[PDB]
RNA sequence: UUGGCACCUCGAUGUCGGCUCAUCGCAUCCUGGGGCUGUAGUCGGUCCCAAGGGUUGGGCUGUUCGCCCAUUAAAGCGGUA
RNA sequence: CUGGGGCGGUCGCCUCCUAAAAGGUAACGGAGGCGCCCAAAGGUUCCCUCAGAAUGGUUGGAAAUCAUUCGCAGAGUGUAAA
RNA sequence: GGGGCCUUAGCUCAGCGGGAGAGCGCCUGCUUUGCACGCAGGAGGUCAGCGGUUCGAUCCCGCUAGGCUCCACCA
């Protein structure tokens, strides 16, 4: 469960997703990447689920260069409650996206292994993506 | 056990120490109270204890200690007792309550008098400041809340009580009321007199009618000469005030109780930790040795029964051979061992000749694997047995540093749990120096860390001992004979001469596993010995 | 179902459960017909096509639900204020 | 006041973000502060300038003080924020 | 229904990544005019389970499980 250990404000305004990825849209710390075609709000539990998936398919698989960090928190009020009475309480964390953004690079392991590992990684996920590699 | 010894002490210190304003009180050690008193108008020392082994009032040797952090116990002492005058040094009759009439021209000027009963009871004694006018405890040591059956309690609010004393005579005399044919008599001394311990009792039984000897040896106590000794008789160290009654051992004459118990016991006291450990480990190497010897003969006992493999294995081979005269639906067979017995086997109808042949091979390899597993288990077990015997081989020569060293060896064996301390050496009778491999690890340090290769080495040939080396000294006739001799009389076979130690170049000295080393390519030298040359 | 909004109804929309009458759906409870099986058979398990018909009687509790006894081939799950 | 009421919470003032680059803009939105303080913490004249880091070196010590170069600036600016 | 605490020795519990331990209790021998013992020890262990963590986990992470404990308005 990726975390920021320290925060300024426990809470935020929620945010939006328009446009496209500023940077990190291409594999250059690793060899064989995966990138977005969409965007959403994402959990460290999900990304580490993919981690364990790929690293068990590969069993130590190479090296990654993860591109992201779940900086954003989100709240979740208690249950069967009405509106108002102040903002809800912080619940977990969130990792945000823009399309064209790369999430995981890979290196040290064969391209075909990469393809299938990231297949099993991708099928976890709510989004549409594709494989990439370095220029 | 009772207070004739204690009352002699009481009188011989009452002669001395009366006339004392209590000056200082010192205790870091848990139950060793150091006092200074203005006794005989002198700043005069004293030691006290009620430790569950140690209790004595001791015009002592060099005192140990000054805490600068005394217990709140000692602060109650400095509160009530310090500045206290010794009116008198009295016995509560004869049982071991040594009364101390503590007057005090205290910080006021009032003459606050109290008792300080010390129930000197050896192991479980109790120094008790009993407020005399009220007979109330104001600070005590041993509890019995009365959470269970017995009688009295510490608490400094608890009113003081005397534990129930017993029908002691406090002295032919036996013939009037009793009989000395009552039975075994030392137990009955214990039952019946206040001149008691079971040992002091039986020694009195040997001091041999008898009650004249009793009251006249008390008259010797009244002479108050009693040249003390510690009779080391079979290690029993009877600290006994006239020279030994009986059992005829030693007599270590301490002219002073000052040195009698402290410098002896304190000399023992560290060693008494060493002997706690040594005797725990005595009982425990005894255990683990006999323990696993039992469990492994038990392994063998359970083992001998079943093989159930090659029977039906060879017949599975037979059916594989005669795999063209078979039905799946038979029990019996017809057989030749290429030998020709014609066994008619069981063959399990509704199951094929193949199926039952390879099932015979299955049970074959199965019993094979089970028994081979159990036999490598038992091989581990036998190497473990002689590993106990090897541990013991070294242990019979082990010193207390080797006790700790083998406690480390058994952390290594996983069996125990408690810095360069390699090994030691001795003066050979031939004016040389022989390195004494005194343990497994001490042998590693004396041979594998210290000694040189192609040297003269030696180990006790099947005797419980330690190893030795004339390291980088090619042991000649004299040197090799002297080294083999030191081994031959340092082993547990020290009575057996001709200890045939194999010596040669240490280059061939094997090493393995772990602790599995050997001295091979070596010619044996049979030796006997004396002892004191080693030093 | 538990819930959120406060949108019709406060110049009135009777609210639980039960009886009688029911009746629509079917992700089927039994019965029809299938394929898979780690389905020997017999019983089974899984999934599919299938709503034509059918899907008990009582003790406890106001109850519902649930429990219990004995059945049945089975004693379904929802809607309709 | 109240996303029915009730409990609870708040009720006035100030700083910020929400606030959509003039300004303004609500919610039982998000966050912090006040019911003061200095008679020198003022007015004026004159003066020089930091925060930390490195080096070195008593007690000095990781850390007092210290020279030492680095050093718009990391400190200070009575007080929250800006 | 939700929140908080907790599962380690037969009992009570600490330990809180690189060695599973204190005491109560059972067993072993010491010995004890308080029958009180104490002594030394010894055995006695799924650190509740699963998963991840790490080079390795009682310990770090998440989940589940339970046990406890606190709090849960009007039709």
PDB file of N, CA and C in Angstrom, chain A residues 81-127:
ATOM      1  N   UNK A  81     -26.181   7.960   6.273  1.00  0.00           N
ATOM      2  CA  UNK A  81     -26.053   9.288   6.841  1.00  0.00           C
ATOM      3  C   UNK A  81     -26.559  10.292   5.822  1.00  0.00           C
ATOM      4  N   UNK A  82     -26.962  11.448   6.320  1.00  0.00           N
ATOM      5  CA  UNK A  82     -27.510  12.506   5.494  1.00  0.00           C
ATOM      6  C   UNK A  82     -26.368  13.383   5.011  1.00  0.00           C
ATOM      7  N   UNK A  83     -26.713  14.499   4.397  1.00  0.00           N
ATOM      8  CA  UNK A  83     -25.711  15.382   3.846  1.00  0.00           C
ATOM      9  C   UNK A  83     -25.127  16.268   4.937  1.00  0.00           C
ATOM     10  N   UNK A  84     -24.131  17.041   4.546  1.00  0.00           N
ATOM     11  CA  UNK A  84     -23.593  18.081   5.385  1.00  0.00           C
ATOM     12  C   UNK A  84     -22.852  17.583   6.607  1.00  0.00           C
ATOM     13  N   UNK A  85     -22.870  18.435   7.630  1.00  0.00           N
ATOM     14  CA  UNK A  85     -22.185  18.183   8.893  1.00  0.00           C
ATOM     15  C   UNK A  85     -20.684  18.026   8.688  1.00  0.00           C
ATOM     16  N   UNK A  86     -20.141  18.750   7.722  1.00  0.00           N
ATOM     17  CA  UNK A  86     -18.722  18.721   7.458  1.00  0.00           C
ATOM     18  C   UNK A  86     -18.329  17.603   6.512  1.00  0.00           C
ATOM     19  N   UNK A  87     -17.191  17.808   5.864  1.00  0.00           N
ATOM     20  CA  UNK A  87     -16.694  16.850   4.900  1.00  0.00           C
ATOM     21  C   UNK A  87     -16.393  15.521   5.576  1.00  0.00           C
ATOM     22  N   UNK A  88     -16.500  14.459   4.795  1.00  0.00           N
ATOM     23  CA  UNK A  88     -16.250  13.132   5.303  1.00  0.00           C
ATOM     24  C   UNK A  88     -14.804  12.933   5.668  1.00  0.00           C
ATOM     25  N   UNK A  89     -14.535  11.747   6.144  1.00  0.00           N
ATOM     26  CA  UNK A  89     -13.258  11.466   6.755  1.00  0.00           C
ATOM     27  C   UNK A  89     -12.348  10.760   5.758  1.00  0.00           C
ATOM     28  N   UNK A  90     -11.035  11.001   5.834  1.00  0.00           N
ATOM     29  CA  UNK A  90     -10.123  10.375   4.878  1.00  0.00           C
ATOM     30  C   UNK A  90     -10.150   8.868   5.005  1.00  0.00           C
ATOM     31  N   UNK A  91     -10.129   8.219   3.853  1.00  0.00           N
ATOM     32  CA  UNK A  91     -10.416   6.804   3.734  1.00  0.00           C
ATOM     33  C   UNK A  91      -9.205   6.012   3.285  1.00  0.00           C
ATOM     34  N   UNK A  92      -8.625   6.371   2.156  1.00  0.00           N
ATOM     35  CA  UNK A  92      -7.461   5.676   1.625  1.00  0.00           C
ATOM     36  C   UNK A  92      -6.605   6.618   0.848  1.00  0.00           C
ATOM     37  N   UNK A  93      -6.194   6.188  -0.337  1.00  0.00           N
ATOM     38  CA  UNK A  93      -5.419   7.021  -1.232  1.00  0.00           C
ATOM     39  C   UNK A  93      -5.878   6.805  -2.657  1.00  0.00           C
ATOM     40  N   UNK A  94      -5.395   7.679  -3.531  1.00  0.00           N
ATOM     41  CA  UNK A  94      -5.814   7.710  -4.919  1.00  0.00           C
ATOM     42  C   UNK A  94      -4.607   8.036  -5.767  1.00  0.00           C
ATOM     43  N   UNK A  95      -4.569   7.427  -6.942  1.00  0.00           N
ATOM     44  CA  UNK A  95      -3.567   7.706  -7.951  1.00  0.00           C
ATOM     45  C   UNK A  95      -4.291   8.063  -9.237  1.00  0.00           C
ATOM     46  N   UNK A  96      -3.985   9.239  -9.771  1.00  0.00           N
ATOM     47  CA  UNK A  96      -4.735   9.816 -10.868  1.00  0.00           C
ATOM     48  C   UNK A  96      -3.955   9.612 -12.156  1.00  0.00           C
ATOM     49  N   UNK A  97      -4.654   9.765 -13.278  1.00  0.00           N
ATOM     50  CA  UNK A  97      -4.133   9.438 -14.595  1.00  0.00           C
ATOM     51  C   UNK A  97      -4.534  10.524 -15.579  1.00  0.00           C
ATOM     52  N   UNK A  98      -3.769  10.631 -16.656  1.00  0.00           N
ATOM     53  CA  UNK A  98      -4.270  11.098 -17.931  1.00  0.00           C
ATOM     54  C   UNK A  98      -3.938  10.081 -19.009  1.00  0.00           C
ATOM     55  N   UNK A  99      -4.716  10.034 -20.086  1.00  0.00           N
ATOM     56  CA  UNK A  99      -4.386   9.123 -21.178  1.00  0.00           C
ATOM     57  C   UNK A  99      -3.032   9.449 -21.777  1.00  0.00           C
ATOM     58  N   UNK A 100      -2.445   8.437 -22.405  1.00  0.00           N
ATOM     59  CA  UNK A 100      -1.091   8.563 -22.900  1.00  0.00           C
ATOM     60  C   UNK A 100      -0.025   8.442 -21.839  1.00  0.00           C
ATOM     61  N   UNK A 101      -0.403   8.362 -20.566  1.00  0.00           N
ATOM     62  CA  UNK A 101       0.559   8.285 -19.486  1.00  0.00           C
ATOM     63  C   UNK A 101       1.040   6.857 -19.336  1.00  0.00           C
ATOM     64  N   UNK A 102       2.325   6.715 -19.086  1.00  0.00           N
ATOM     65  CA  UNK A 102       2.925   5.425 -18.792  1.00  0.00           C
ATOM     66  C   UNK A 102       2.885   5.219 -17.292  1.00  0.00           C
ATOM     67  N   UNK A 103       2.618   3.981 -16.894  1.00  0.00           N
ATOM     68  CA  UNK A 103       2.448   3.607 -15.501  1.00  0.00           C
ATOM     69  C   UNK A 103       3.599   2.763 -14.994  1.00  0.00           C
ATOM     70  N   UNK A 104       3.935   1.718 -15.732  1.00  0.00           N
ATOM     71  CA  UNK A 104       5.010   0.808 -15.392  1.00  0.00           C
ATOM     72  C   UNK A 104       5.897   0.638 -16.607  1.00  0.00           C
ATOM     73  N   UNK A 105       7.181   0.927 -16.430  1.00  0.00           N
ATOM     74  CA  UNK A 105       8.189   0.451 -17.359  1.00  0.00           C
ATOM     75  C   UNK A 105       8.584  -0.953 -16.921  1.00  0.00           C
ATOM     76  N   UNK A 106       9.337  -1.643 -17.766  1.00  0.00           N
ATOM     77  CA  UNK A 106       9.904  -2.934 -17.409  1.00  0.00           C
ATOM     78  C   UNK A 106      11.253  -3.054 -18.088  1.00  0.00           C
ATOM     79  N   UNK A 107      12.161  -3.778 -17.448  1.00  0.00           N
ATOM     80  CA  UNK A 107      13.446  -4.056 -18.061  1.00  0.00           C
ATOM     81  C   UNK A 107      14.069  -5.260 -17.377  1.00  0.00           C
ATOM     82  N   UNK A 108      15.027  -5.871 -18.068  1.00  0.00           N
ATOM     83  CA  UNK A 108      15.743  -7.008 -17.542  1.00  0.00           C
ATOM     84  C   UNK A 108      15.148  -8.349 -17.893  1.00  0.00           C
ATOM     85  N   UNK A 109      13.985  -8.378 -18.546  1.00  0.00           N
ATOM     86  CA  UNK A 109      13.276  -9.616 -18.838  1.00  0.00           C
ATOM     87  C   UNK A 109      12.700  -9.519 -20.243  1.00  0.00           C
ATOM     88  N   UNK A 110      12.525 -10.679 -20.871  1.00  0.00           N
ATOM     89  CA  UNK A 110      12.224 -10.756 -22.286  1.00  0.00           C
ATOM     90  C   UNK A 110      10.923 -10.048 -22.622  1.00  0.00           C
ATOM     91  N   UNK A 111      10.828  -9.667 -23.890  1.00  0.00           N
ATOM     92  CA  UNK A 111       9.702  -8.887 -24.364  1.00  0.00           C
ATOM     93  C   UNK A 111       8.422  -9.704 -24.332  1.00  0.00           C
ATOM     94  N   UNK A 112       8.524 -11.006 -24.566  1.00  0.00           N
ATOM     95  CA  UNK A 112       7.330 -11.836 -24.636  1.00  0.00           C
ATOM     96  C   UNK A 112       6.772 -12.061 -23.244  1.00  0.00           C
ATOM     97  N   UNK A 113       7.668 -12.363 -22.313  1.00  0.00           N
ATOM     98  CA  UNK A 113       7.330 -12.382 -20.902  1.00  0.00           C
ATOM     99  C   UNK A 113       6.699 -11.064 -20.502  1.00  0.00           C
ATOM    100  N   UNK A 114       7.244  -9.959 -21.004  1.00  0.00           N
ATOM    101  CA  UNK A 114       6.669  -8.650 -20.725  1.00  0.00           C
ATOM    102  C   UNK A 114       5.229  -8.586 -21.200  1.00  0.00           C
ATOM    103  N   UNK A 115       4.999  -9.043 -22.429  1.00  0.00           N
ATOM    104  CA  UNK A 115       3.670  -8.990 -23.020  1.00  0.00           C
ATOM    105  C   UNK A 115       2.669  -9.743 -22.164  1.00  0.00           C
ATOM    106  N   UNK A 116       3.012 -10.961 -21.771  1.00  0.00           N
ATOM    107  CA  UNK A 116       2.032 -11.764 -21.051  1.00  0.00           C
ATOM    108  C   UNK A 116       1.878 -11.299 -19.609  1.00  0.00           C
ATOM    109  N   UNK A 117       2.980 -10.888 -18.988  1.00  0.00           N
ATOM    110  CA  UNK A 117       2.914 -10.353 -17.640  1.00  0.00           C
ATOM    111  C   UNK A 117       1.975  -9.171 -17.588  1.00  0.00           C
ATOM    112  N   UNK A 118       2.118  -8.261 -18.538  1.00  0.00           N
ATOM    113  CA  UNK A 118       1.294  -7.076 -18.522  1.00  0.00           C
ATOM    114  C   UNK A 118      -0.088  -7.347 -19.069  1.00  0.00           C
ATOM    115  N   UNK A 119      -0.275  -8.450 -19.785  1.00  0.00           N
ATOM    116  CA  UNK A 119      -1.630  -8.917 -20.040  1.00  0.00           C
ATOM    117  C   UNK A 119      -2.330  -9.227 -18.730  1.00  0.00           C
ATOM    118  N   UNK A 120      -1.702 -10.069 -17.910  1.00  0.00           N
ATOM    119  CA  UNK A 120      -2.317 -10.435 -16.639  1.00  0.00           C
ATOM    120  C   UNK A 120      -2.450  -9.222 -15.733  1.00  0.00           C
ATOM    121  N   UNK A 121      -1.523  -8.276 -15.848  1.00  0.00           N
ATOM    122  CA  UNK A 121      -1.640  -7.029 -15.106  1.00  0.00           C
ATOM    123  C   UNK A 121      -2.842  -6.230 -15.578  1.00  0.00           C
ATOM    124  N   UNK A 122      -3.006  -6.135 -16.890  1.00  0.00           N
ATOM    125  CA  UNK A 122      -4.031  -5.292 -17.476  1.00  0.00           C
ATOM    126  C   UNK A 122      -5.416  -5.812 -17.154  1.00  0.00           C
ATOM    127  N   UNK A 123      -5.592  -7.131 -17.208  1.00  0.00           N
ATOM    128  CA  UNK A 123      -6.928  -7.678 -17.016  1.00  0.00           C
ATOM    129  C   UNK A 123      -7.455  -7.454 -15.609  1.00  0.00           C
ATOM    130  N   UNK A 124      -6.608  -7.012 -14.681  1.00  0.00           N
ATOM    131  CA  UNK A 124      -7.105  -6.565 -13.390  1.00  0.00           C
ATOM    132  C   UNK A 124      -7.986  -5.340 -13.528  1.00  0.00           C
ATOM    133  N   UNK A 125      -7.775  -4.558 -14.567  1.00  0.00           N
ATOM    134  CA  UNK A 125      -7.912  -3.134 -14.382  1.00  0.00           C
ATOM    135  C   UNK A 125      -9.156  -2.564 -15.056  1.00  0.00           C
ATOM    136  N   UNK A 126      -9.656  -1.422 -14.584  1.00  0.00           N
ATOM    137  CA  UNK A 126     -10.889  -0.847 -15.139  1.00  0.00           C
ATOM    138  C   UNK A 126     -10.727  -0.106 -16.457  1.00  0.00           C
ATOM    139  N   UNK A 127      -9.530  -0.078 -17.034  1.00  0.00           N
ATOM    140  CA  UNK A 127      -9.198   0.904 -18.058  1.00  0.00           C
ATOM    141  C   UNK A 127      -8.806   0.247 -19.370  1.00  0.00           C
TER     142      UNK A 127
END
